[PDB]
Each structure stands twice: as C-alpha cells, then as structure tokens.
Design a protein around this ligand. Structure first.
Ligand SMILES: CO[C@@H]1CCN(c2nccc(Nc3cc4c(cn3)nc([C@@H](C)O)n4[C@@H](C)C(F)(F)F)n2)C[C@@H]1F
Length: 297
C-alpha cells in the first residue's frame, strides 16, 4: 500500500559552498547564485541557494521532501540541504532565470520551434510528476526555469502534494479539489503565457471575479500567433469536466507533432531567422565547472 520513498536527502556542509550574488528575494527569504565545491572531488557545481519561525522551517522541509523525491530531465531536483542557523535548499543554477521573464525579454528572438518544444518539455515534466502521483498545484510560466534556451524544467514544489486563482481549475477555486487534471488547466494557462510572450492572464480583473467569469464560460483569448490548432488544445485544458481535458501524455504527443512543422502551427514574423544562445556559441558558459545534471554520486 504505496511504495517506500527511498530518495536520499544529502546534508551539505556550509564550508562546501559559496554565495556569489542575490538572484531573487521575497517573504520566504533570498535565493543566491553560488558554487558547490564537494569534498576533494575537483568539481565546481553552479547552484541556486534558497535561504530562509517554526512554521516557515516546516514548509521549507516539506518542499525539500518533494524536491528531493523527483528525478527527471524536465523537473528541478534538490541537490541537498544545509542545516545552519537558517535552513538552506541547494538547487541547480538555471542561468536564464524563469521562462516568464525569458519570453518577455527575448520575445524578438523567440521562434515557433522554441515555443512548441517548451510545451513538449513542460508536458513531459508534468507527465513524470503524474507517474510519481504528484499534484503540483502551482504550475505557471514563473515556475518553469531555463537551464538553456533549449532546455526548461518545472520547479517550485512549495504547494505540491501526493493561492494562484488565475492559473487554477474551477473545481480548485470553488471546492479546493486538486488532481493531475487540475494541473492540466494550469498547463493551459502556462501555454497561454508563453504564446502571448508573458502577458498577465485576465489583466485588471480581480481574483474574486475569476470564478464568476469562468462559470459563464469566458476563457483566455486566442493569442495572435496561435492557429486554431494550438488554441483548441488550450481550450480543451479549460473544460468544466476534468476528465474531458487532455492528459499530459496526449499533450506531449500533440505538441510533438506540431514541433515537427512549427510554422504550420504558430505564425511569427521573421521566424527561422531568429537566434538564441546555445552551448555551441563563443563565451556561452571557470576550471572544473560541471553542471549538476552531470554530477552523479
Ligand atoms: C520560491 O522558491 C523557489 C523554489 C524553486 N526555485 C528553484 N528551483 C530549482 C532551481 C532554481 N534555480 C534558479 C532560480 C533562479 C535563477 C537561477 N536558478 N535565477 C533566478 C532569477 C534571476 O529569476 N531565479 C529565480 C526563480 C529565484 F530563485 F531567484 F527566485 N530555483 C526557485 C525559487 F527558489
């Protein structure tokens, strides 16, 4: 009756890592860019260090539990924790930040190939979470991070289980019902954010008016770049009947077929003549630096 979770929680010494600069800050605490230099290993791993009252410590340890329990190319895993006066989460540095800020800042160089591929990768990551019986409950473009422009990962397990109104399924707003199918709704909203190059969903409408608006049948509008093929997918993610919504495995298939002929599915001016940084560029990436994805003890 439910499988033992044999994930390893790695406790890291404070002396093993250094903080370089602040990446972000909120009520939770601060996230630092850093380097992890294990034992006598001759490796430097670029890391994001989340630094943090008894309840805040329980919530960070709950997120640490979930984050240490995942292992997929399209999901962010916990590298370890540091037990100092303040508890720190050691995660992989995602050097291009969140996908939301990336689509806003690089809009003039984002072609249909990148957009459709990001959709496939998010669906792959989400399908993995589903296989793991994990309901994210906070999927949004802000919680998809960019390792490279061609590789994105889902993160922020602070709400994950075995309030973001504008990304939530109607059952979730009204009854607090969360399933893999309620994550599919959030997936649809995330796709809309990517296709509109980071527009705010239902901008100006207060969160208390969203449930009423959804009940009448109003949905997010068709982004200008989206063909009816792409929009019809987003719309199916926003059906009232949760079981009528597509499954993540089907979203992988649908977006993959589209990623094979991207210009037939997304209409972007100057598409294919657009350039984004890749690991085959000068000064893209300093001795003994190894990405967390290749550091496997
Ligand atoms: C609220 O806590 C969440 C927990 C999940 N998290 C996360 N998960 C895995 C890897 C990772 N690394 C990570 C996060 C980064 C980053 C580089 N790497 N650059 C930024 C800024 C410039 O945009 N961020 C954001 C999201 C920040 F963390 F500052 F808020 N960050 C991001 C954040 F710490």
């Amino acid at each position: 009756g439910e499988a033992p979770n044999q994930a390893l929680l790695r406790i890291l010494k404070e002396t093993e890592f250094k903080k370089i600069k602040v990446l972000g800050s909120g009520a939770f605490g601060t996230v630092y860019k850093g380097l992890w230099i294990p034992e006598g290993e001759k490796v430097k791993i670029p890391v994001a260090i989340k630094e943090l009252s008894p309840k805040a410590n329980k919530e960070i340890l709950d997120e640490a539990y979930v984050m240490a329990s995942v292992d997929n190319p399209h999901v962010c895993r916990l590298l370890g924790i540091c037990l100092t006066s303040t508890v720190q989460l050691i995660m992989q540095l995602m050097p291009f930040g969140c996908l939301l800020d990336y689509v806003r800042e690089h809009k003039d160089n984002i072609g249909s190939q990148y957009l459709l591929n990001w959709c496939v990768q998010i669906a792959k990551g989400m399908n993995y979470l589903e296989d793991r019986r994990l309901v994210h409950r906070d999927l949004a473009a802000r919680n998809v991070l960019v390792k490279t422009p061609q590789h994105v990962k889902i993160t922020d397990f602070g709400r994950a289980k075995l309030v973001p109104i504008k990304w939530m399924a109607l059952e979730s707003i009204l009854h607090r019902i969360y399933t893999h199918q309620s994550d599919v709704w959030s997936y649809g909203v995330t796709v809309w954010e990517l296709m509109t190059f980071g527009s705010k969903p239902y901008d100006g409408i207060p969160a208390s008016e969203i449930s009423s608006i959804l009940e009448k049948g109003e949905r997010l509008p068709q982004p200008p770049i989206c063909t009816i093929d792409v929009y019809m997918i987003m719309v199916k993610c926003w059906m009232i009947d949760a079981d009528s919504r597509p499954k993540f495995r089907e979203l992988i298939i649908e977006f993959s077929k589209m990623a094979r002929d991207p210009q037939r599915y997304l209409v972007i001016q100057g598409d294919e003549r657009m350039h984004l940084p890749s690991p085959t560029d000068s000064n893209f990436y300093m001795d003994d630096v190894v990405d967390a994805d290749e550091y496997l003890i």
